[PDB]
Design a protein around this ligand. Sequence first.
Ligand SMILES: FC(F)(F)c1c(Cl)ccc(-n2ccnn2)c1Cl
Ligand SMILES: *[C@@H]1O[C@H](CO)[C@@H](O)[C@H](O)[C@H]1NC(C)=O
Length: 350
Amino acid sequence: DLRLHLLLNTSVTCNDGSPAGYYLKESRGSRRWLLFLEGGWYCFNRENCDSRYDTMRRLMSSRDWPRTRTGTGILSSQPEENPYWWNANMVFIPYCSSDVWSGASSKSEKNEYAFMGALIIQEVVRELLGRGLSGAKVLLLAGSSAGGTGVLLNVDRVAEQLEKLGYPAIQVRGLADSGWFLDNKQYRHTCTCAPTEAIRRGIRYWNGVVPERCRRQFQEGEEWNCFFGYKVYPTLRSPVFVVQWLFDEAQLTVDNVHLPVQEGLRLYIQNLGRELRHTLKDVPASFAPACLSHEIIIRSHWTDVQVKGTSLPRALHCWDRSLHTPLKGCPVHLVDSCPWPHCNPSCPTG
Ligand SMILES: FC(F)(F)c1c(Cl)ccc(-n2ccnn2)c1Cl
Ligand SMILES: *[C@@H]1O[C@H](CO)[C@@H](O)[C@H](O)[C@H]1NC(C)=O
């Protein structure tokens, strides 16, 4: 249902210099726009990016992209699959920059790869304005995994971009799914590169950019801190809803945890969930189930998980209402308190 458009500005490119793009399904009677950032890890040096180019080329190039994609989960146009925003204008932005959506660097005589994630988002927004986005009332920038961190890094820049283009009435909001990570100690030490070390190397290789207020706090050489949700979120002005499994599989991977569990690992896992829960305590719009999993919002069965009896599509609807005092029976802060994966019976089965 979503049709591919390669960017008209062919200077905004995937890693290999092929044009970036977006998949679009318009909904002509709607002023809601959902722009979804795909995830898919990252690469932080020539050797690891070369390997990714061999066996994950669609994440580095548009040369082999299909002409259409089916919208699923929050990108579905069927109310049965998407109770939240089924009638919205739907945009899926493929992740082909390997930079957690942070890069602003072209391929050149000094750069084998272009890392243009931050510029891809800006260019998609610019080109959509002529396709109906100029009439929008709400632009929800959503994303999963690396795309979820991409929301945190870019939501306020989209807001600033629309303001400077003369569209102050479009309300820009963010939905960060599975992009809220902890710069914690690994369970066993290995660069499965530790989260702190991975981002420090990548940001230099990508010429990565972070939100301005966060950059002003951490300053030169320390911008890697702004890739961590609990540090960047308090600096953001746009409303951001945070979805994060308490025992996220990507978090455990970078922590070198691989799953009978003995005391040391049991304590490690329980402490991880408690730390994640703590970082969400003052995030008013959040959905954090006690599950071992990764991503949720574009899965066809994303409607199934509940926290305290409330599904994610319901919580997002309650968030919409809150952005028109708490709402009777329409909660927006939903964080599990039970301390072990699958202590929530609605967790994905696998
Ligand atoms: F390492 C880390 F720091 F925890 C981190 C960050 Cl900041 C942002 C995105 C990812 N990620 C996971 C899967 N795709 N991207 C990770 Cl794993
Ligand atoms: C194309 O994108 C580049 C990089 O974002 C930008 O500098 C340039 O102004 C863009 N060109 C047009 C015509 O928008």
